[PDB]
């Protein structure tokens, strides 16, 4: 038998402390290792689109209802109009999203795309295997459209339990999406074709058309990793990257919150439909929930008292239902705008902003189709094994105080490396990588009191 639950304090992790230091030099924290890793997100863009027959939800054409309902017929017209407008908004957002998805040009994609990187996200030419993994783990009821109506009907298995057959009892209609999954697959491959890349100016006109690995090297110089380190570690980079890629097969668990969100989008759509279905059996104080039953058993002067109790309650649930749909539709529109923003930032460009994208600086991100939305994933850089080193604000010529320099995208640190005869060395800012100070890594700056007075040799300036 299991042990009793245990009371515990919530742990608080502490940041590595780095002492502030006075004078002309200071401690600097630098990582000595890193790993690739990934994060994921699901952004819903749509609500399932439905309509409701306003005659059938109340009654089945029984004629007492047919005449009594005429007094309330304008409410049905309001209901239908509101639902119709909600569905138009859903289709508007789809077209607007796709207008930013399209590119004037893209690379063709063949197997072996991305070079030594595995790229298992590539289509099995087909929807990508990753999209299919998501679809298989999702618990959603089998789809309508074809065969639709004949999957309700006795010409099919007796074990179907789909709300889609209940669509033809309740008067519901589920509208097809505008987007078409085949056209959608073409759009996601088109996005993959815009990769390599984000660099080389804005990229909003020209198309670089270069290999993926080269664009990665470009991005890593963009975060201060020296070019020399990148050339030494090229296979290491591919190995760590593909280790993170392989971790995606463990990404479909209930502990993955993005995955959980996908499942609840489905649950919410199914839940709304089930609520209206359950209300068909709900008496409103009427003798029975069946209209034909109360007609058969009652004298007509009292018969329609019972019918009106039923009619009023059916209308009331429809009013609540429409209001619920309008709210959800508006939140979906805002959510869709966020997805569009990430496509035009997190995907189409490298970013220095933090915030958006996974939290590990930023390097390329990808997006795939998910039901009712987009599923994003982000490659990121995670620092490790931080050390403290001595560093200086800048260096100057002691023979001439106006000759002052400071590092570009990096730092000047006291050397601890036996290859370098010079007392100081340049390093990258994202990784520990000491190197000789050269004119390529520095810039001239105005003089300042904290800059070191160097009495011997500098190659930048030579004098």
């Amino acid at each position: 038998v299991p042990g009793e639950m245990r009371l515990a304090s919530i742990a608080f992790n502490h940041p590595i402390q780095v002492d502030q230091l006075n004078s002309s030099y200071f401690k600097l924290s630098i990582p000595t290792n890193f790993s690739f890793g990934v994060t994921q997100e699901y952004i819903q863009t749509t609500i399932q689109k439905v309509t409701v027959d306003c005659k059938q939800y109340v009654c089945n054409g029984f004629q007492k209802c047919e005449q009594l309902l005429r007094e309330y017929g304008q409410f049905c017209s309001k209901i239908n109009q509101a639902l119709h407008g909600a569905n138009l908004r859903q289709d508007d957002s789809v077209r607007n999203l796709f207008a930013s998805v399209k590119s004037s040009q893209s690379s063709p994609i063949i197997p072996g795309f991305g070079g030594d990187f595995n790229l298992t996200l590539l289509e099995p030419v087909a929807r990508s295997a990753i999209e299919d993994l998501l679809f298989d783990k999702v618990t959603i009821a089998d789809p309508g459209y074809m065969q639709g109506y004949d999957d309700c009907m006795q010409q099919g298995p007796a074990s179907a339990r789909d709300l889609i057959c209940a669509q033809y009892v309740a008067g519901y209609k589920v509208l097809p999406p505008l987007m078409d999954v085949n056209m959608e697959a073409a759009y996601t491959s088109s996005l993959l074709g815009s990769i390599a890349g984000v660099g080389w100016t804005a990229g909003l006109s020209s198309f670089a058309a270069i290999p993926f690995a080269q664009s990665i090297f470009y991005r890593l110089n963009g975060v201060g990793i020296t070019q020399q380190v990148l050339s030494e570690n090229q296979k290491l980079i591919a190995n760590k990257f593909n280790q993170a890629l392989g971790a995606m097969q463990t990404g479909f668990t209930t502990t993955n919150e993005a995955f959980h969100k996908v499942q609840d989008a489905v649950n919410n759509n199914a839940q709304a439909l089930s609520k209206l279905a359950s209300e068909l059996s709900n008496t409103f104080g009427a003798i029975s929930a069946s209209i034909g039953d109360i007609i058969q058993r009652l004298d007509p002067p009292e018969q329609d008292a019972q019918i009106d109790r039923l009619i009023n309650g059916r209308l009331t649930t429809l009013n609540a239902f429409v209001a619920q749909q309008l709210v959800r539709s508006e939140s979906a529109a805002l959510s869709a705008q966020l997805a569009k923003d990430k496509v035009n930032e997190c995907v189409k460009a490298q970013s220095k902003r933090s915030g958006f994208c996974g939290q590990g600086t930023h390097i390329v991100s990808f997006v795939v189709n998910a039901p009712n939305g987009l599923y994003f994933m982000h490659v990121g850089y995670y620092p490790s094994n931080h050390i403290e080193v001595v560093s200086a604000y800048g260096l100057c010529d002691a023979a001439n105080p106006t000759n002052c320099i400071a590092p570009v995208n990096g730092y000047f640190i006291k050397t601890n490396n036996t290859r370098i005869v010079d007392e100081w060395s340049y390093t990258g800012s994202s990784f520990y990588a000491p190197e000789p100070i050269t004119s390529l890594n520095t810039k001239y700056v105005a003089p300042q009191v904290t800059y070191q007075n160097i009495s011997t040799n500098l190659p930048p300036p030579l004098l």
Partner: protein, 99 residues
């Protein structure tokens, strides 16, 4: 109320004790929280009461006293004084409930 014995007395009506429970589905076990009530008013059985039994708690808590926490008194929680980042059953505050 002013009583006709010449003394003012006053009335607070009465209060109820809020309750919540911790359910660990993986081990299929549970423990409980009595809200802010404090263990001065807590006893091994209940004289009030919200439900006909307390016995499911008693399955392990027949052998243990009530424990005070920063939210309030609980049953079966065990003071392990462990530090853990996320118990998935947090009680709020710095309190936590390890499986």
């Amino acid at each position: 109320y002013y009583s006709d014995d010449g003394n003012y007395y006053c009335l607070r009506a009465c209060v109820s004790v809020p309750v919540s429970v911790i359910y660990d589905k993986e081990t299929k076990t549970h423990a409980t929280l009595f809200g802010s009530v404090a263990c001065e008013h807590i006893s091994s059985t209940m004289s009030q009461y919200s439900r006909s039994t307390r016995s499911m708690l008693k399955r392990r808590d027949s052998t243990y006293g009530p424990l005070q926490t920063p939210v309030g008194c609980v049953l079966g929680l065990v003071n392990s004084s462990l530090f853990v980042e996320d118990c998935k059953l947090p009680l709020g505050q710095s309190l936590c409930a390890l499986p």
